[PDB]
Amino acid sequence: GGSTRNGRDSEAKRLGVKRFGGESVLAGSIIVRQRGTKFHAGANVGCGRDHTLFAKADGKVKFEVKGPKNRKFISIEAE
Amino acid sequence: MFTINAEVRKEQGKGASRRLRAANKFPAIIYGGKEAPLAIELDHDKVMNMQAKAEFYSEVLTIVVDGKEIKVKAQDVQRHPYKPKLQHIDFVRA
Amino acid sequence: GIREKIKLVSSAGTGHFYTTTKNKRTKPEKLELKKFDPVVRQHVIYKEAK
Amino acid sequence: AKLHDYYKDEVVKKLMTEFNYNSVMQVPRVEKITLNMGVGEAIADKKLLDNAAADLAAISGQKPLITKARKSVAGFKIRQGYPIGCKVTLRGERMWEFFERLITIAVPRIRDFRGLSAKSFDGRGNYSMGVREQIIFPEIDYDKVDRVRGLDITITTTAKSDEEGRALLAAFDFPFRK
Amino acid sequence: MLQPKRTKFRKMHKGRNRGLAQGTDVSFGSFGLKAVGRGRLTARQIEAARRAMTRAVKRQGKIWIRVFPDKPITEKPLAVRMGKGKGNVEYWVALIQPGKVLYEMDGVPEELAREAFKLAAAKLPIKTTFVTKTVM
Amino acid sequence: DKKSARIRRATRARRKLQELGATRLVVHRTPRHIYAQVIAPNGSEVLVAASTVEKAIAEQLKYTGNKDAAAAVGKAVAERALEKGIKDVSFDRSGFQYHGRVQALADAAREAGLQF
RNA sequence: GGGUGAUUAGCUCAGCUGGGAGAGCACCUCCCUACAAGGAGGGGGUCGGCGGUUCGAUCCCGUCAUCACCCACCA
RNA sequence: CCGACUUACCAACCCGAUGCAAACUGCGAAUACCGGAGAAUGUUAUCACGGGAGACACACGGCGGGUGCUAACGUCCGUC
RNA sequence: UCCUCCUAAAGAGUAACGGAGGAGCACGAAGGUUGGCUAAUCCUGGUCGGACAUCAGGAGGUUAGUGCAAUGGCAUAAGCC
RNA sequence: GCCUGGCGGCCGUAGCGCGGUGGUCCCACCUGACCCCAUGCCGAACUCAGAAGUGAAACGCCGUAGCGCCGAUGGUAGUGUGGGGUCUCCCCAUGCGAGAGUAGGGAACUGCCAGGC
Known part of the structure; x- marks a missing residue:
């Protein structure tokens, strides 16, 4: 050719894995270049159309499978 | 196919399968007929020479377990990929 | 490209003009939409698009 | 309603009180007539079929619809978002009011009338009773007319049988071809 | 001889053979030939073996071949220094493993099926062994 | 049915009022009867229920869908x-x-002291 | 093999914007005499193959089939 | 106005025999990788700022893959 | 130089002048919002429709559609009105 | 208890077809619209006053291997670790252990409440 380029996959890899947390703010399911795979639940209200679980808390991230089509939901855990 | 004898087994999987298949015994199972599955060990003497004849799969077989004799039929036969050897066998109740 | 940047006048006669990217010389369609103003900060009608 | 009040008791009794029938609402009834008029064939002139839908006030008493096409197709110069007809289709109240006007009064104005529907029944009231060029319904002071104007109409039911529908279309006066 | 007419991809991993795969049981007929080792199989070898069985059994019975080449493989036409991408595909190849039944027959005598598979086995790169229906 | 395509038009709004949580009034209607029943956020208990099936309406009203x-x-x-x-x-x-x-x-509930 | 281009009426091609196929010569036929000629009509195209992108693919893309040509350079 | 003969002739849709996929997924592991509470042993091993570097050219043996003739004291990478 | 689908081993990182397809702009609308809607394709039947239009019913199904290329999301639709 | 209906719990074994059945109560056709209100067309949605007729369409409940849907046992594949060898890969010991295939399941379970019996 020409070229097949290869390019890059870039960094910015997953943060929303296992029981962990922040200290002042946590975005416990934030992801790049992907949308509509994860959702937010509980009483704390996360982000809009992206449904990322956001919290202003010292509390840890909760992972659940809930409702119709056993969908992936995210919340804050009580301790 | 005249009556054969078997014994109950509790140790199982890979190493116990290969240690049973030591040119002396085979693993087998009996299932169906509204009763639970039973795991058994079978001596190599008769069963291999019996499965040489097509009547082994088209006519019922009598098996002794715990001294008591019951009727079954042959259903499936698992073989070895690189030697002429028997790996495992299924029987269904009647 | 061939579309190019263009500035709009306002019905308030502002010195500040509103910018968009829109064709005039080969495919004119004009623009009138109202936007935020820097003089009293309560919006003005940006119109005509030359 | 004044058409069904007769049909629910006085006729079609062989599917209401005779063998295998004890439920009186189990026989089919008329509710819809598939009257349609297209405009998307004149898509290169765009004015030829602009006011055709405004002169259907003798065959449909209802207000027309704007419509859109089913698929974008190049040899018909049409986009999916573009208008294709005008609907004017009668269902319910203005359908029974048209069933009292079809084949009841314009009987001295026919050209041949050899039987209308003869085949192509299936289960959904598939009785095609279109005119093949119109005869004009009796009306006050008309004097100028056009060529190749007519309508296509099927009295489609919510049914599954046009064998039982042949008792509905024999409960009222309708010709058939012999 | 023996390759598909359309392909989604032609540049492929050569890969290695696991020694297992599907096979062992005869199910198109009553007699067959089994691979009983590891090696490499081509379409020219399959055709040379087909041409061998048709001298032994002639028009008698039916003959089934459950085997067909596994991958396209790239080659360059002259002896050469490697580089500047892979070459092109003129043949397909398969890796065979001991449990693979290669050929099956039925409407023929057993002593003829064994003799025909002996004649066909002479066209193949490895030692091969005769197999029966085993009643099941 | 003549209800599923109606119920579909509330799913998005139900999930937005899920950000305020709390009880649901469950106003429901049929041609002959009108209903309301305050249910808990989990569906496990009810607070209060009222309908045109009650003796305090069914003898006062000429039609219970009026x-x-x-x-x-x-x-x-x-x-x-x-x-x-x-x-x-x-x-x-x-x-x-x-x-x-x-x-x-x-509106009749707002004048009768319902906080809405 | 590696590369740069192309394929439309019998023959030589026009038309390479993503919008329904065209000229000259021939063919066949009439007027002119027996005929090259002059004139007038009549007749046929998967526009190379197969998928893909699309409202739409001769046309844009990929890959073959065929054709024309350059390169087997460094010691 | 639609009929009859032939055909290892084809086939939506469904299925069995049969052999299959990194750029396919209507099933599906073992370990690895990280946070929090807590204990035991330790070379205080830690993380961070300040003074000084040197270095960014490497080979081999198992494990597992791509690449080559599953050739080469071959080659490109992962893993320890 | 920039975007990924694979190579990649279900931490990150990551190999071929390897394999496949793109960006250097367009969209005042495909933008905000209230309410409403459900595809392609294939089968049959229906007026002036003559494989094919206008439309009626079925079968079918995260096969349509979304500025633009792959993967991911899409019915509460982000698709269309 | 058994049913009629509502909004849920759970995220399908619960479905569709075929068959059985009710309206007494509930409910959906259905009655009437000229009325308060409306349709990119419409008494379709919605509106407003209902009960002449119906258990049909629809609807709830239920039965049943035609179809959709779901799969045990053992053996096998794969794998973590430590040891051995006749080492383009295999063995022995051992924790974990699929998927297809077979037998089989298959037409739910139900929480809270108003009313009918």
Whole structure:
């Protein structure tokens, strides 16, 4: 050719894995270049159309499978 | 196919399968007929020479377990990929 | 490209003009939409698009 | 309603009180007539079929619809978002009011009338009773007319049988071809 | 001889053979030939073996071949220094493993099926062994 | 059916009023009867229930689907909600259009002390 | 093999914007005499193959089939 | 106005025999990788700022893959 | 130089002048919002429709559609009105 | 208890077809619209006053291997660790252990409440 380029996959890899947390703010399911795979639940209200679980808390991230089509939901855990 | 004898087994999987298949015994199972599955060990003497004849799969077989004799039929036969050897066998109740 | 940047006048006669990217010389369609103003900060009608 | 009040008791009794029938609402009834008029064939002139839908006030008493096409197709110069007809289709109240006007009064104005529907029944009231060029319904002071104007109409039911529908279309006066 | 007419991809991993795969049981007929080792199989070898069985059994019975080449493989036409991408595909190849039944027959005598598979086995790169229906 | 395509028009709004949580009023209507039933956030218990099936409407109203019968349930669910001490929370109308007998129930409840 | 281009009426091609196929010569036929000629009509195209992108693919893309030509350079 | 003969002739849709996929997924592991509470042993091993570097050219043996003739004291990478 | 689908081993990182397809702009609308809607394709039947239009019913199904290339999301639709 | 209906719990074994059945109560056709209101067309949605007729369409409940849907046992594949060898890969000991295939399941379970019996 020409070229097949290869390019890059870039960094910015997953943060929303296992029981962990922040200290002042946590975005416990934030992801790049992907949308509509994860959702937010509980009483704390996360982000809009992206449904990322956001919290202003010292509390840890909760992972659940809930409702119709056993969908992936995210919340804050009580301790 | 005249009556054969078997014994109950509790140790199982890979190493116990290969240690049973030591040119002396085979693993087998009996299932169906509204009763639970039973795991058994079978001596190599008769069963291999019996499965040489097509009547082994088209006519019922009598098996002794715990001294008591019951009727079954042959259903499936698992073989070895690189030697002429028997790996495992299924029987269904009647 | 061939579309190019263009500035709009306002019905308030502002010195500040509103910018968009829109064709005039080969495919004119004009623009009138109202936007935020820097003089009293309560919006003005940006119109005509030359 | 004044058409069904007769049909629910006085006729079609062989599917209401005779063998295998004890439920009186189990026989089919008329509710819809598939009257349609297209405009998307004149898509290169765009004015030829602009006011055709405004002169259907003798065959449909209802207000027309704007419509859109089913698929974008190049040899018909049409986009999916573009208008294709005008609907004017009668269902319910203005359908029974048209069933009292079809084949009841314009009987001295026919050209041949050899039987209308003869085949192509299936289960959904598939009785095609279109005119093949119109005869004009009796009306006050008309004097100028056009060529190749007519309508296509099927009295489609919510049914599954046009064998039982042949008792509905024999409960009222309708010709058939012999 | 023996390759598909359309392909989604032609540049492929050569890969290695696991020694297992599907096979062992005869199910198109009553007699067959089994691979009983590891090696490499081509379409020219399959055709040379087909041409061998048709001298032994002639028009008698039916003959089934459950085997067909596994991958396209790239080659360059002259002896050469490697580089500047892979070459092109003129043949397909398969890796065979001991449990693979290669050929099956039925409407023929057993002593003829064994003799025909002996004649066909002479066209193949490895030692091969005769197999029966085993009643099941 | 003649209800599933109506219920589909509330799924998004139900999930937005899920950000305020709390009880659901469950206003429901049929041609002959009008209903309201305050349910817990988990569906495991009810607070108060009122309908045009009650003796305090069924002998007063000429038809239990009438506009004044919806208002009569409105002032009945309110006097019960006030007795159960229910405060300012969102309204729940089961995919029905508010203008009509649903608004007649809601306005009669507002004058009877329902916090809406 | 590696590379740069192309394929439309019998023959030589026009038309390479993503919008329904065209000229000259021939063919066949009439007027002119027996005929090259002059004139007038009549007749046939998967516009190379197969998928893909699309409202739409001769046309844009990928890959073959065929054709024309350059390169087997460094010691 | 639609009929009859032939055909290892084809086939939506469904299925069995049969052999299959990194750029396919209507099933599906073992370990690895990280946070929090807590204990035991330790070379205080830690993380961070300040003074000084040197270095960014490497080979081999198992494990597992791509690449080559599953050739080469071959080659490109992961893993320890 | 920039975007990924694979190579990649279900931490990150990551190999071929390897394999496949793109960006250097367009969209005042495909933008905000209230309410409403459900595809392609294939089968049959229906007026002036003559494989094919206008439309009626079925079968079918995260096969349509979304500025633009792959993967991911899409019915509460982000698709269309 | 058994049913009629509502909004949920759970995220399908619960479905569709075929068959059985009710309206007494509930409910959906259905009655009437000229009325308060409306349709990119419409008494379809919605509106407003209902009960002449119906258990049909629809609807709830239920039965049943035609179809959709779901799969045990053992053996096998794969794998973590430590040891051995006749080492383009295999063995022995041992924790974990699929998927297809076979037998089989298959037409739910139900929480809270108003009313009918």
